[PDB]
Amino acid sequence: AISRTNENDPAKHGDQHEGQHYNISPQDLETVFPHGLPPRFVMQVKTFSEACLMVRKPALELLHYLKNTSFAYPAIRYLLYGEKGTGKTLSLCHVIHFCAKQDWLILHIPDAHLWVKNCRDLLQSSYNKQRFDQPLEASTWLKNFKTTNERFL
RNA sequence: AUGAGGUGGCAAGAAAUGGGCUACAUUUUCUACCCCAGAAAAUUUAGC
């Protein structure tokens, strides 16, 4: 299995694991990723009966940045960009899985495009009459946020 | 007057058959895009 790596701990991946697939346990799948993974990667997980992510340079660089982050300075914005279907979503998922294992609090938005299109129950906020509420989109995210961060609640 | 005008009136129904016009969707429809997204829901006439 030249394409697999036995190191299933994202905190110990480096340049020597590049191009190799590491396994995410079903517990980690259901806890860390109720909603994150791309729709067509969930089919592969269901068909292969295992979730495996390749270790790539973008994720390695973004993990090296997060390992040396100073928590006293203001939060740094990292933006993954690339051509269509290049793996940036799964790189973000790799980074989320790294952060979850170190008892970070995860605020994961799986797709912000869903909040700006195709909303059937749009309401007007009682808090601020000039804004609109999206109960179906907010309650769906709240359940998965509770699932991911149940310990800290 | 087979020319030019005035006045009023003339409104039509039945089938049997032939044709024409419209919409007819899941391989569909709406939005973004111009193709890796999100939501909704037997007879018979021609042609190659």
Ligand SMILES: Nc1ncnc2c1ncn2[C@@H]1O[C@H](COP(=O)(O)OP(=O)(O)OP(=O)(O)O)[C@@H](O)[C@H]1O
């Ligand atoms: N690190 C990876 N490990 C395994 N498969 C991967 C990886 N990166 C990409 N893939 C494959 O590529 C497919 C698309 O990846 P992904 O959804 O991350 O793309 P993307 O660049 O975020 O796409 P888009 O521009 O459409 O948002 C994944 O479903 C998987 O098949």
Ligand SMILES: [Mg+2]
């Ligand atoms: Mg993506």
Ligand SMILES: [Mg+2]
């Ligand atoms: Mg008449």
